[PDB]
């Protein structure tokens, strides 16, 4: 009966690109939600299927932690029922979501003076992601009626594109590390309690 490892997913040094978003499963542990309410640093903390404060005295079968980096102006898309480029082609929550979305500004870490180009978003996809899908393909997107045959050009576009995170950007285009906790409830016996 040892701790839940939220310190290694929240306090982690390197963060995924949103299109290739990371996922840490959380099983068989006792969860100190204290580190969430006592943080000051979070810019977002909306919960969905649960009451945000009662997290302590609650029990779950499995908890999942998803981490990635987006713009400030995009955090409003990491929430059930939202649409748009991130929600449609990078990371969608079910409508029946039960969990908490957490974010915080990371301009000081994830920006660089010439722009940090490590962090990527998918700009093109033929279909909206289904919820919790992850698409890491790098095929050339075919906007035209003729095949691209492995050559980018007119109507033939690489599907990923980079944020140009410079520290001088407006808040809208500053980076924000995001953590999405999924509280899974299965008929099987619980393993994540307080």
């Amino acid at each position, epitope marked *: 009966t040892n701790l839940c490892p939220f310190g290694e997913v929240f306090n982690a040094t390197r963060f995924a690109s949103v299109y290739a978003w990371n996922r840490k499963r959380i099983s068989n542990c006792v969860a100190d939600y204290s580190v969430l309410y006592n943080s000051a640093s979070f810019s977002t903390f909306k919960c969905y299927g649960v009451s945000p404060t009662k997290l302590n005295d609650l029990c779950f079968t499995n908890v999942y932690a998803d981490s990635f980096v987006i713009r400030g102006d995009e955090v409003r898309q990491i929430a059930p029922g939202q649409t748009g480029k991130i929600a449609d082609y990078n990371y969608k929550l079910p409508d029946d979501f039960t969990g908490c979305v957490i974010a915080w500004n990371s301009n000081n870490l994830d920006s660089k003076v010439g722009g940090n180009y490590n962090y990527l978003y998918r700009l093109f996809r*033929k279909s909206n992601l289904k919820p919790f899908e992850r698409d890491i393909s790098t095929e050339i*997107y075919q906007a035209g009626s003729t095949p691209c045959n492995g050559v980018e050009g*007119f*109507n033939c576009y690489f599907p990923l594109q980079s944020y140009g995170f410079q520290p001088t950007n*407006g808040v*809208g*285009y500053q980076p924000y590390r995001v953590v999405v906790l999924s509280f899974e409830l299965l008929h099987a016996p619980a393993t994540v309690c307080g």
Partner: antibody
Framework: EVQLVESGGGLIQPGGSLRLSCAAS????????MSWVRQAPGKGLEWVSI???????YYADSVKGRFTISRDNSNNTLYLQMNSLRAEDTAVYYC???????????????WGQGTLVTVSS | SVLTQPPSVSGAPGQRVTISCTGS?????????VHWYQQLPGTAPKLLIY???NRPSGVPDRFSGSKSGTSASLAITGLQAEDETDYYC???????????FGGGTKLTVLG
């Protein structure tokens, strides 16, 4: 190789309805950010609606609830159903492919010729 | 008109005219890039510059662009009379998540 040809515009009573069509060739509409931008006679440009490659739609606040952007794979066509037309809806309606490929914001890199909508009694 | 451009600018052939586009912290100051379109009256707009400064294929190196803080600028060097048309800038605004256009600029070629 590539073309956008709009039609459907005319003269309509205020309150009436109309469906604009934008036939494409070269572009597969269903695979593109497609958009309607309009321009009142003698006046500037105003975006109207967009539809995302995966199907999401958005609208200028002036037309929200009145206008509907859809597309057809069979006809390879973009449509704009305009209901409850007001006088201020009078303009030339353009069909455009939208891209964000070198930028942080979307732009319209290929445009059709425009179809004229005149709402008056 | 969200973005703001001069109603008109003038130049003689061979000169260098610039057309400004000033926005705010909800668009250009938010980090949404600026784009520039040319429209001859009676015709359809044509993408001239995208992403602040890139030229689509088919646009002569005469046209260039730039963006600083909340303003952006279209430079036309070696002005020719075929450039006697209307110019529009365009960005996106985050206050109202809607793409916004400048008001337009009519370029008159003199001399």
């Amino acid at each position: 190789e590539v073309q956008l040809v709009e039609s459907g515009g005319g003269l309509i009573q205020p309150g009436g309805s109309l469906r604009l069509s934008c036939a494409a060739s070269g572009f597969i509409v269903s695979s593109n950010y497609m958009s309607w931008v309009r321009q009142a006679p003698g006046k500037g440009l105003e975006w109207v609606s967009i539809i995302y490659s995966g199907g999401s739609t958005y609208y200028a606040d002036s037309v929200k609830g009145r206008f509907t952007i859809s597309r057809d794979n069979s006809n390879n066509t973009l449509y704009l159903q305009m209901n409850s037309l007001r006088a201020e809806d009078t303009a030339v309606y353009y069909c455009a492919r939208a891209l964000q490929v070198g930028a942080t914001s979307d732009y319209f890199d290929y445009w059709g010729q425009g179809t004229l909508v005149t709402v008056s009694s | 008109s969200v973005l703001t451009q001069p109603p008109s600018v003038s130049g003689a052939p061979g000169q260098r005219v610039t057309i400004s586009c000033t926005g705010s912290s909800s668009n250009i100051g938010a980090g949404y890039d600026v784009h520039w379109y040319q429209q001859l009256p009676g015709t359809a707009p044509k993408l001239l510059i995208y992403g602040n400064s890139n030229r689509p294929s088919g646009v002569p190196d005469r046209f260039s662009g730039s963006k600083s803080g909340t303003s952006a600028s279209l430079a036309i060097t070696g002005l020719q009379a075929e450039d006697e048309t209307d110019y529009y800038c365009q960005s996106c605004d985050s206050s109202l998540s809607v793409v916004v256009f400048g008001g337009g600029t009519k370029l008159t070629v003199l001399g």
